[PDB]
Ligand binder design. Structure first.
Ligand SMILES: *Cc1cc2c(cc1C)nc1c(=O)[nH]c(=O)nc-1n2C[C@H](O)[C@H](O)[C@H](O)COP(=O)(O)OP(=O)(O)OC[C@H]1O[C@@H](n2cnc3c(N)ncnc32)[C@H](O)[C@@H]1O
Ligand SMILES: O=C([O-])c1ccc[nH]1
Ligand SMILES: [Cl-]
Length: 385
């Protein structure tokens, strides 16, 4: 017997941010999650996340990146949890052979972002611990950094709840009933209604959007990360080793400086196992590629950070065909908002997206230009059942 103004299904990176934005405005919100956020079953754990402004995936993301950065600084001031460390982000690759590096440079120029350009030995000299061939070039963004993702979700949740938002945990939504003037969700712990619905189930969007009569190609990928004992005099955040995302012949890698001695963290971005979110093996090390693809990068580019494996994590990316997000109203229901297919690069925008989802649910519009994330774009290959 409890109607809500807005129901958020999936209270992770996007959902909890939306919950906070709504609660902050006095909107009676209910957030439902299959687990208890922040947790290690979705796409937001592993402690840290990179936030970049000059965007290699496309200069069109810059405005949202900058707005999210300001929102992260706001969050830092509101909670006792640590939110952001300004490590700076280094992007490098073989000269003339990296669309990622090239677009990062164009994005910086187009938006007048503050960056340093360097190449070859200048890279190795500036950051002892990095060994790149002389034909490599780079763009460093000093004001970009590292977000503590689990802390962000925890902070958004504590703040939203302090303002009246309710979070129903360990409750998996199994079906939806949408009408022109209301929405309803069904779970084993009961059913709930509201005027608006925000759907942000992460990897599970690939399995349950069909319950909303949507048919969108979405592929979940198993993506691991490892923490390695490193030479702290070189790879510690304390001596300014940066976060980084780089392109080499066999793909894109990313990493973080060692924070408080927990070790340099590394991940292989362009390769992962296609999986189903309910059958994925969440144990690091079960596939030999988990650790080997990482050491293959370290022994070659960051040899002093190739020590004992201290920790591993298994997480998921949910890719769309063009690797751009889906943030829009359900094409048949203006009272339903969809947030999906973040394709391995959405956390840094979660604060900004929470704001967009909020506007979409309350007004059916957003002040942000979100056309590139349209659910009706052709490259997406979307359709109704
Ligand atoms: C996995 C990964 C991702 C990643 C990254 C490194 C790894 C190993 N590094 C990143 C980085 O440095 N910078 C960045 O900007 N992004 C990075 N990413 C990607 C980012 O983490 C993902 O894009 C982001 O987390 C996506 O967020 P979203 O909110 O979509 O996903 P979630 O946080 O997993 O939340 C979904 C929640 O919904 C719940 N759920 C699922 N099904 C149900 C049902 N049926 N009912 C109720 N709740 C449901 C989940 O439990 C989850 O909490
Ligand atoms: O989007 C990013 O910055 C990122 C780093 C690792 C995966 N995604
Ligand atoms: Cl993702």
């Amino acid at each position: 017997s409890t109607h809500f103004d807005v129901i958020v299904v999936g209270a992770g990176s996007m959902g909890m941010a939306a919950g906070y934005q709504l609660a902050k405005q006095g909107v009676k919100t209910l957030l439902v999650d299959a687990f208890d956020p922040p947790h290690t079953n979705g796409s937001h754990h592993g402690d840290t996340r990179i936030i970049r402004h000059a965007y290699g995936e496309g200069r069109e993301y810059v405005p949202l990146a900058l707005r999210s950065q300001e929102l992260w600084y706001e969050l830092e001031k509101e909670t006792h949890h640590k939110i952001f460390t300004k490590t700076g982000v280094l992007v490098f690759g073989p000269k003339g052979e990296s669309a990622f590096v090239a677009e990062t440079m164009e994005a910086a120029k187009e938006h007048s972002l503050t960056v340093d350009l360097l190449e070859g030995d200048e890279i190795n000299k500036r950051w002892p611990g990095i060994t790149v061939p002389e034909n490599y070039n780079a763009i460093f963004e000093p004001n970009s950094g590292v977000l503590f993702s689990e802390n962000c979700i925890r902070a958004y949740r504590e703040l939203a709840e302090a303002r009246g938002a309710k979070v129903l945990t360990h409750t998996r939504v199994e079906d939806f009933d949408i009408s022109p003037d209301s929405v309803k969700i069904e779970t084993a712990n009961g059913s709930y209604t509201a005027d608006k619905l925000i759907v942000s189930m992460g990897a599970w969007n690939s399995k349950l959007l069909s319950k909303l009569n949507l048919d969108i190609p979405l592929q979940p990928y198993r993506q691991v990360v490892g923490f390695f004992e490193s030479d702290e005099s070189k790879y510690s955040n304390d001596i300014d080793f940066p976060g980084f995302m780089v392109e080499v012949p066999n793909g894109i890698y990313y990493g973080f400086p060692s924070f408080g001695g927990c070790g340099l963290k590394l991940g292989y971005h362009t390769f992962g196992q296609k999986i189903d979110p309910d059958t994925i093996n969440r144990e690091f090390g079960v596939y030999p590629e988990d650790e080997s693809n990482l050491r293959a990068f370290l022994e070659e580019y960051m040899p002093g950070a190739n020590g004992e494996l201290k920790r591993g994590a298994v997480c998921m990316y949910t890719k769309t065909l063009d690797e751009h997000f889906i943030i829009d109203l359900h094409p048949e229901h203006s009272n339903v908002v969809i947030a999906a297919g973040f394709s391995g690069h959405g956390f840094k925008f979660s604060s900004g997206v929470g704001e967009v989802l909020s506007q979409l649910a309350l007004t059916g519009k957003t002040e942000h230009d979100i056309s590139i994330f349209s659910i009706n774009r052709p490259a997406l290959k979307e359709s109704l059942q």
